[PDB]
């Protein structure tokens, strides 16, 4: 003897009563294996076993059941449980078993590899394709809501503080400050272009700062 | 090649000028290429395989470790791997420690769970322990050689337009190289900071960051295990058994 | 009537994972467990294995008594199923894995666990360090050692050509998972607590090492 | 007793829509399904089709086995019902459509769906691009090419006179829906995911093109 | 045999019991076709 | 199915007509191009019945005949 027939039988009764009718306690995977073993081992439940086994994948079918076959399935399932049932009960129990058999089981942990640096590929990309790709990537991010205290533009009309900041930054040449700001902006832009494997258009960057002559001439 | 930038303010004709050397940007771009880092790692592995080949070590590593009788080959393989890693760290010394002894372990009863290659001082000479069944179990384990780990457009455009080293053998070579790399990190802490620090590190690997970054992070190349960021699946859930209402003021390892 | 081939394949894959003989990470469902158990029952020469794994349903019922010929035959059966070495500790790993899988409840998301309950002496890493260090010092050394690093450009080019089609990421994944599984199996077999804090701190050390 | 003619007309229209052989968009109600099924049952030479569509009630019961003569006879029956080419894939489309219609619940507003579950190899657009591109490059070219654009005012006037009564909007609707249905059927038959984002972006491209 | 008589019959019983008395669960179109087929065949 | 020349001529003429509509200065389309007619699903593109490719020597145009037949 390899199969403890009766304990398997009660386990299958409990599981099928739970799935078929009580669609709303909890059971282990062992009970599912037990129910399938009972269905296979019992001769008169072969049709039900095949019907439930068809739920393993999406490329399995059942031949159209004639009348006597569906009555045999019905009174077999009734013998499993006196309560009146029909083919709809079979359908809901089959759907429940389909949901159950697709439930993942325990697995051991694995070492997951994450990309250290967003390394770009060999082929150079232009600004437009890079913009499209990075916008698609940004679309997947989760935006955060910012709520300002009021609608009014922040400002300050404290004279003393204003002339005091002006005096503190008075000995500071505008040429050096603007040069430092522009050069750090340019260096960061070029570094991002180089890291992103993107072609840097010098003419566009020059066109960025032509508002100088636009103001001066007009 | 050099690139020059000029800034002009509207208060005068003064122009302040800076010269940028493009080589820095080219170096960053090259370091950002996936093929470049892949080539670096594959070239390290190819150099390792060539080093084994010139030492007659052409037999597959699993077959080398499966031979219980012939210990000389196992000792030579481990010593050569240690020397290769040492040269990678210090590209000036071609010969490893001139004298050291090897002992091969075939029993669980005297095996270390997680450090297959261990080092010890017998008061006279360095001694290296090799857990042969552990390495055999490592190399003989079946590998996932059909799954894909995450460009189709370039393939589409292309479509519209002799030593037999299998993938299993290369994976075995990389496995042994990484294992000996871990052993060599332990050995480096040993040789440079004493037996006490070595046995402290054996039970707490977190001292590696302090005892390597002081010298290795600015003088040697990149470590092989640093090519990818490794994490344990569902690490937080499994670690939930050991959770502290902590207050970390010396978080020296993020 | 059941399809022997499909059930055998599902059993092969599930047992490969549950024996820690493979790093192939495929999402396993309850259907695979049902298929492996049914195939184990149906096949005549896997009856010993089927009974062994079925005894795991109740934690109080432990492994059936098998004489040496029976254990050898079951080992040959497992080897044939896996067509691969395999020994008693592999069977112990399989028993523990299937016991934990069976006693686990039906749930929507895969449960991630670590190897446990295999192989009296519940120890830690340091006591093992001392004991196995003394035992190793007992062992006589076998070989005494008292180096060509050739850069033959053509030879390295041919080696790179051979290695080029290999997806480096896959090789790294295989090597890392192999090391992790060997370490975990050695910890569990030695009845020593596996501190995954330390193992994860290894990777954290590598990550912190790179950026400097 | 039932009216064979009315039931036949309802069946003809519903099957025309459900086979994607017509762009006629008429709101179909449950009554049309009842009439088509009743007519299919009553007519002797549509018994094969009636059984075929009735098997779709349960998803686990798949298509009945038919020998080649039976499939040919059913194809002739479908052709006669439609008085129209028609082949096996049309029958597959009809089976999938009727299965989804039957398993759908009774609801107050018409449910808009796309063709699915017709014709193992679940692919995407790019893998198909590569594979069929290689297969096309295999095929030998048939004709090698190594242009009058006449503006005959009288001839264009006569052509415009012939075309003038045609409601241009209807022609555009027919052409666009025909292209959409052919593309969807090719996607579903090839077992490739139909990305309606791209198809709608085609129209969005046209709209953005015009206003510049 | 083209009509699975009894399953059709119970489907029609359920649908007509729902519509006639329980004017207030849910049913599919297939059940409606089933009920009409039963009514015609009987 | 038998007469491919007519299909190739029709597709080429339609392409030339559209090209002239875009550029009302060139009456002759690309002076040399080849045509291949597809009759199989096995080598059919789901949604692009007319496709173009370079065989490293000359333009090649693919025509999915059953798709166009099903359309019309």
UniProtKB/Swiss-Prot annotation, chain A:
**What domain of life does the native source organism fall in?**
Viruses
Keywords assigned by UniProt? Answer: Host nucleus, Late protein, Virion
The protein's location, in the record's own words, is:
Host nucleus; Virion
Kindly state one GO CC term assigned in the UniProt record.
Answer: virion component
Q: What does this protein do?
A: Plays a role in host nuclear actin polymerization by recruiting p78/73 protein that is capable of activating an actin-related protein 2/3 complex to initiate nuclear actin polymerization.
Give the record's family classification: Belongs to the baculoviridae C42 protein family.
Name under which the protein is recorded: Protein C42
Species for this entry: Autographa californica nuclear polyhedrosis virus (AcMNPV)
From-to range in the entire protein, with total length:
112 to 334 of 361
Swiss-Prot record, chain B:
Q: Does the keyword Isomerase apply?
A: no
State the UniProt keywords alphabetically: Host-virus interaction, Membrane, Modulation of host cell cycle by viral cyclin-like protein, Modulation of host cell cycle by virus, Viral envelope protein, Virion
Q: Where in the cell is it found?
A: Virion membrane
Mostly located where?
virion
What the entry lists under InterPro entries is as follows:
Baculo_ODV-E27
Q: One GO biological process from the UniProt record? A: symbiont-mediated perturbation of host cell cycle progression
Q: How does it assemble?
A: Interacts with host mus209/PCNA, cdc2 and cdk6. Forms a complex with proteins C42 and p78/83.
UniProt lists the family membership as follows: Belongs to the baculoviridae E27 family.
The protein here is known as Occlusion-derived virus envelope protein E27
Organism equals Autographa californica nuclear polyhedrosis virus
Gene name of the record: E27
UniProtKB/Swiss-Prot annotation, chain E:
Q: Which cysteines are joined by disulfide bonds?
A: none
Source species, domain of life: Viruses
What this chain does, per the entry, is described as: Plays a role in host nuclear actin polymerization by recruiting p78/73 protein that is capable of activating an actin-related protein 2/3 complex to initiate nuclear actin polymerization.
Q: What is known about its subunit structure?
A: Forms a complex with proteins E27 and p78/83. The interaction with p78/83 mediates nuclear translocation of P78/83. Interacts with protein Ac102. Interacts with IE0.
Query: What is the similarity comment for this entry?
Result: Belongs to the baculoviridae C42 protein family.
Q: Which residues of the full protein are shown?
A: 112 to 155 of 361
- The protein here is known as Protein C42
Where would you find this protein in the cell? Host nucleus; Virion
Curated annotation (Swiss-Prot), chain F:
Q: Which superkingdom, per the lineage?
A: Viruses
Asked whether the keyword Membrane is assigned, the reply is: yes
- Please state the span of the N-terminal signal peptide per the UniProt entry: none
List UniProt keywords, sorted A-Z.
Host-virus interaction, Membrane, Modulation of host cell cycle by viral cyclin-like protein, Modulation of host cell cycle by virus, Viral envelope protein, Virion
Is Lyase a UniProt keyword of this protein? no
Where found?
Virion membrane
Query: Which biological process terms from the Gene Ontology are attached to this UniProt entry?
Result: symbiont-mediated perturbation of host cell cycle progression
A single GO cellular-component term on record: viral envelope
Task performed by this protein: Acts as a cyclin-like protein and plays a role in the modulation of host cell cycle. May promote G2/S arrest by interacting with host mus209/PCNA, cdc2 and cdk6. The cell cycle arrest is characterized by an intact nuclear envelope, concomitant with sustained activity of host cdc2. However, viral DNA replication still occurs in the arrested cells.
| Homology family | Belongs to the baculoviridae E27 family.
The subunit field of the Swiss-Prot or TrEMBL record says: Interacts with host mus209/PCNA, cdc2 and cdk6. Forms a complex with proteins C42 and p78/83.
Could you tell me what this protein is called? Occlusion-derived virus envelope protein E27
Annotated organism of origin: Autographa californica nuclear polyhedrosis virus
Full-sequence range covered: 74 to 145 of 290
